[PDB]
C-alpha cells in the first residue's frame, strides 16, 4: 500500500531518506568502530576478551588484533580499517590514532551537516587543516635521535612505544629490543623488522628473557651432535617414517619370518637413505613431522645433525634466509636445493637448549629475541609489543624527529589550527575549528582510560599552552589529574607516526564523507 519506501529502487537496499540522513548512518558505523578501540588507547588501555575464530580465548589490547578478529562488515568502517592497514606501511604504530581521530572528524562533521553546511565544504576544511597541521608539526619537534647507536639512547626513546602494549614491563623490553636493534644499525640503509625475529618459549616470566644472534629455534637438537659448521643444510617436509613407493610397490607378506625380512630390508634401506645425506656433503637434516627411532641413530652414525621444526612458519623462515627448500620425498639426495650457513650449533639459555643458525664467517645482520613466559597468550601479547617497538626505530632510520606525546601535540596542534580558523574568513572555518577539536579526543581518551574527568585535563593542558609551556602532556596517574612535562619524563612520539596518521585519517574521513549512498551490485 502506498506511500511505500522513498528512494528505494536498487535491489531493495536500505536507502535512508532525506529525513533519515544517509550520511549520518555511515558515520555511526565509524563511531562504533572507535568505541571498540577508544578504551584501549594509552598505557592504561583496557584489554579485550577476544574470542578467536577457532574458539580460542585471548585477552589483549592491541588494535590490529582487535580488528583482525572483529569481522568488520560495514564498508564505511572498512575504509578506516584500510587506513589502519596503510598505517602499518611506512610506520608500525599510531593505529588507534587513525580510529580515534577519524571517528572524531566524522562525529564532529555531523554537527556541521546538521547546521546545513555542505559535505563538499566540510571536506575542503579538513584538507586545509591537514595541510596546515603538516606545517605546524615540524615546529613541535622537541628532540631528535642522536643516532649514536647507544643502548642507553635507544632504550630511553623506545619506552613510549612499548607502553600501551605491555605496561609495567617497559624497562626489560626496552633494553632487550635496544640490544637487538643496535646490532643491525651498523648495516646502514638496510634495517628492517624481518631481521629482528621473535621466539617464544614457555618459561618462568618475562624477566627471564634475553637476546641471541642468528635464527633461534626453541626445539632443541634431537640428534647427539653438539655443533657442526656444515653449510649444506638439507630440509625435508616429509617425516622420517615407513617408506612408501611412488610406483605400485606392492608389498605382500604372509609368514612371520617374511615380516622380519621386510622389516630388516626397510632398516637397510633407511641406513642407505641417511648414508646418501652424508654422501652429498651435508651433515645437517631438518624434519617437519615425527622422527623415527632407527633413523635417529643413523643421524648419529654419520654425525648428521638432526633438526626438528614442527611449525610451518619456522620452516619457511629458513627457506628465505639459507635457501634450503623442503622437498616432498623422504630424504632425496638433492644437493642442488640445499641451503648455506656459516655456523649451526646448540646453546642452552634459561635452562633450555635451542637450535641456533649463527653467521660467524659472514658479517651477520640477523637477530632474535628469545622471550620467556608462563602463558602462551602472554608471550603473544608481548610479541605484538616487539613489532610495534622495533618498527618505531625502523622509522628512526629515516629523518630522526621526535615530538612530545601524552596528548601534548594534540592540544598545541589544535591550538595552532584553531587560531588559523578564527582569522580565516568564510565557511571553511567551521570545519577547520572542528578539525582542532578532533585532536582533543586523544587526550580525552587517555584521561577516560585513566579514570580522570577529561574536561579538566583539556582545561589544564590549554592553560599551560596559553602560557607557552609546550611539551606538556597528561600525567598518567589515578589519584592525580594534573599534568607534567613529557620532555622531563622522557615520553616522546615519532614525527612520521603523527604525520602519516593525520594524513591517512583525514583521507579516510574525507573518503567516507564523499560517499552518500551504499548500493549493491552483481557481476
Amino acid at each position: 500500500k502506498a506511500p511505500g519506501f522513498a528512494q528505494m529502487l536498487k535491489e531493495g537496499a536500505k536507502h535512508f531518506s532525506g529525513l533519515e540522513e544517509a550520511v549520518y548512518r555511515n558515520i555511526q558505523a565509524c563511531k562504533e568502530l572507535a568505541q571498540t578501540t577508544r578504551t584501549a588507547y594509552g598505557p592504561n588501555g583496557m584489554n579485550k576478551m577476544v574470542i578467536n575464530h577457532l574458539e580460542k580465548l585471548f585477552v589483549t589490547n592491541d588494535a590490529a588484533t582487535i580488528l583482525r578478529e572483529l569481522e568488520v562488515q560495514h564498508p564505511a568502517a572498512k575504509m578506516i580499517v584500510m587506513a589502519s592497514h596503510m598505517q602499518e606501511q611506512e610506520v608500525g604504530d599510531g593505529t588507534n590514532f587513525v580510529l580515534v581521530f577519524a571517528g572524531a572528524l566524522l562525529e564532529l562533521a555531523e554537527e556541521l551537516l546538521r547546521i546545513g553546511l555542505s559535505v563538499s565544504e566540510v571536506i575542503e576544511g579538513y584538507e586545509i587543516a591537514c595541510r596546515k597541521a603538516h606545517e605546524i608539526l615540524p615546529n613541535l619537534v622537541c628532540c631528535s635521535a642522536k643516532n649514536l647507536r647507544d643502548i642507553d639512547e635507544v632504550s630511553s626513546l623506545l619506552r613510549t612505544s612499548i607502553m600501551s602494549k605491555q605496561y609495567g614491563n617497559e624497562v626489560f623490553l626496552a633494553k632487550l629490543i635496544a640490544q637487538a636493534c643496535v646490532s643491525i644499525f651498523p648495516d646502514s640503509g638496510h634495517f628492517n623488522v624481518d631481521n629482528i625475529r621473535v621466539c617464544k618459549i614457555l618459561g618462568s616470566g618475562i624477566s627471564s628473557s634475553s637476546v641471541l644472534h642468528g635464527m633461534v629455534f626453541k626445539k632443541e637438537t634431537e640428534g647427539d651432535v653438539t655443533s657442526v659448521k656444515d653449510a649444506k643444510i638439507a630440509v625435508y617436509s616429509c617425516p622420517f617414517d615407513g617408506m612408501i613407493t611412488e610406483t605400485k610397490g606392492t608389498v605382500l607378506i604372509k609368514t612371520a619370518e617374511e615380516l622380519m625380512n621386510f622389516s630388516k630390508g626397510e632398516e637397510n634401506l633407511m641406513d642407505a637413505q641417511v648414508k646418501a645425506i652424508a654422501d652429498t656433503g651435508a651433515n645437517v637434516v631438518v624434519t617437519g613431522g615425527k622422527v623415527a627411532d632407527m633413523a635417529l641413530h643413523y643421524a648419529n652414525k654419520y654425525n648428521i645433525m638432526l633438526v626438528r621444526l614442527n611449525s610451518k612458519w619456522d620452516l619457511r623462515r629458513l627457506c628465505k634466509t639459507v635457501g634450503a627448500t623442503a622437498l616432498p620425498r623422504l630424504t632425496p639426495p638433492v644437493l642442488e636445493e640445499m641451503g648455506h650457513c656459516d655456523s649451526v650449533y646448540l646453546s642452552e639459555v634459561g635452562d633450555t637448549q635451542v637450535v641456533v643458525f649463527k653467521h660467524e664467517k659472514e658479517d651477520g645482520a640477523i637477530s632474535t629475541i628469545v622471550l620467556r613466559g608462563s602463558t602462551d597468550n602472554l608471550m603473544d601479547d608481548i610479541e605484538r609489543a616487539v613489532d610495534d617497538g622495533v618498527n618505531t626505530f625502523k622509522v628512526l632510520t629515516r629523518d630522526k624527529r621526535l615530538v612530545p606525546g601524552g596528548g601534548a601535540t594534540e592540544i598545541e596542534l589544535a591550538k595552532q589550527i584553531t587560531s588559523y580558523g578564527e582569522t580565516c574568513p568564510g565557511l571553511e572555518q567551521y570545519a577547520i575549528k572542528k578539525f582542532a577539536e578532533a585532536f582533543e579526543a586523544i587526550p580525552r581518551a587517555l584521561a577516560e582510560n585513566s579514570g580522570v574527568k577529561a574536561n579538566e585535563v583539556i582545561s589544564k593542558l590549554y592553560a599551560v599552552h596559553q602560557e607557552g609551556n609546550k611539551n606538556v602532556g597528561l600525567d598518567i596517574e589515578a589519584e592525580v589529574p594534573a599534568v607534567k612535562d613529557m620532555l622531563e619524563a622522557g615520553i616522546l612520539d615519532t614525527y612520521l607516526g603523527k604525520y602519516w596518521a593525520i594524513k591517512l585519517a583525514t583521507n579516510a574521513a574525507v573518503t567516507v564523507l564523499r560517499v552518500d549512498q551504499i548500493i549493491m551490485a552483481k557481476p
Binding site: Q7, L9, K10, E11, G12, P75, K78, M82, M86, L117, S118, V119, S120, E121, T511, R514, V515, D516, Q517, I518, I519, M520, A521, K522, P523
Partner: protein, 521 residues
Amino acid sequence: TLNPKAEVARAQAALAVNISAARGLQDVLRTNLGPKGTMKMLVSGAGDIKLTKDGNVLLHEMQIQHPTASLIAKVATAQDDITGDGTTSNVLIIGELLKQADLYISEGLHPRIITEGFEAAKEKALQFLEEVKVSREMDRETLIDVARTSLRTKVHAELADVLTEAVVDSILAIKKQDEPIDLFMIEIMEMKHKSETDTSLIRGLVLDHGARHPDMKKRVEDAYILTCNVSLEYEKTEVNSGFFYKSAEEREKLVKAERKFIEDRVKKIIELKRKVCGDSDKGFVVINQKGIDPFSLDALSKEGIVALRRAKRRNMERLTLACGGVALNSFDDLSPDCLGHAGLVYEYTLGEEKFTFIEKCNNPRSVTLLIKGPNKHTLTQIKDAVRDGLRAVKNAIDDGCVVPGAGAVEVAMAEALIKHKPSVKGRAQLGVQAFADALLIIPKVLAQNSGFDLQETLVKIQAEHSESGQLVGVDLNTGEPMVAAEVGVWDNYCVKKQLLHSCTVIATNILLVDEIMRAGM
C-alpha cells in the same frame, strides 16, 4: 475482463510507473554531476569496492530493481560508445523531460503531442550549437582546459593537473599527419608499490616479465632487438623419434638428448649477436615471447645480452613496430632481417617486483601510460578517468569544434527555444516549453552539488544578458555567474549533439508506452 496469469495497466498508470522510475534514477545520479558531486560505491557482494562518478559504470556494472530503469541503463551504454561522455546528464534530462510532460499530461494532453514538440525543439536546439560552437585550432592550452574539464569530474582535483599533461601529450604523441586517432596506439599499464600522484608517461612499451639473472645489463642504451616466438625450454622430440627410457638414469639421457634441440639454437643467438655489429660500443636484446630455460638465460647473459620471456601477443606486435625485427617462428632460419633497433632499455625496480621499459624508440607510433597507485580500486578509478579523458581530447581533435560548459549552452538554448514558435501545430508549444525547462536541470544540479541555492544560481546566469553574444555559466566555487570561455571550461560538440538526439529519442519512446503487459512474468 482479464485472463488468469495476466495483468495489464490499460489507463495512464503505465506512464506514471515509467515516469516515477526516471525521477528515481534522476535523484540518484544527480549527486555525482561535476567535480563537486559526491561519489557512488559499487559493492560486488563478494567484498570488492569500487568508487566512481562515471554514469556508465553506475548503470552498466550496477544492478537496478526497476525493469523500466534498466532500459535507460542500456542507453548509457550506447551514449558511452559513441561520444564517451554525457551519460549522467543524459539521465537527468530524461527525468526532467518526463517530469514536465507529466505536468501537462495530467491536464489531459496526449503524449504524442508532447513528442512532436521535442522533435521541433531538438531540431532548433541542434542549430544553436552550430552558431555557438567555437572552431578553435587544437593547441596545448586548449586541450588542457578540455582534459581538465573531463578529468576533474573523476578525481579529487589533485590528479587533474598531473593527469592532464599526460593525457594531452599521449594523444599528441600519436596525432600527426592528419591521421584518424586510434586509442589502440596507447596501452594502459598499472603498478602498485607507489602512490597515486606518481603517474607519468612512458615513451615506449612496458612489459610484465623482465630479465631475471645476475649477469644481465641493468640498462641497454642501444641494441638490435630480435623478435622471436620459439621456446628455449625443455620441449618434445621434434624429429621422427620419441621418448623411450628404462630407468630414471636412462630418462635423464633423453633430457640431455632432447636438450640438444635447444642448445644448438641458443648458440644461434650468440652467432647473430656477434654477426650484426658484435664489436665494442654495441649491444643486443632478445624479446622472445615463449619460455626460456635458465641455461639459455645464463649463457646469453655472459655475452651481455638482455633476453626476455613470457610476454603477450599484443606486446609482441607493438614491440616489432618499435624495433623493426619481424618475428622468427623457428631459430633455424635466423637472419639479420628479424632484428630491430631501440634506445635506452632499462629495468624499473619496485619494492618487490620489477618491470621492463623500452623507452627511446625510433618510430613506434605508439606509447604507454604508466599508472601508479597504492590501492587496487584506486587503479581502476584512475583508469576509467584516463579513458574518459583520452576520448575527450579525441573528440576535440576528431571534431575540431568545441562548445562552452557549465550549463551555458542549456541556459542559452532554453532562451532560444522560448523565442521560437511552432510550424506544425500550436499545442507543440507546450512540448517546447518542457524541453526548455528540462535543459535547465544541469545548471540546477551543479548548484546543488556545490552547496548553493538552486534558484539563486539559475536566476543569476539566466538574467545575465547583454547586447552581444555572451556566454554565462555556474561558478562551482563562488556560485555567481561565469563566462566559461574566460576560465577554460569547454565541452565537446559531439557530446552535446548526441545528448539532444539521445534524450529526445528515449523520452519520446517512454512517453509512447500506452500499456505494460506481463509476458508470463
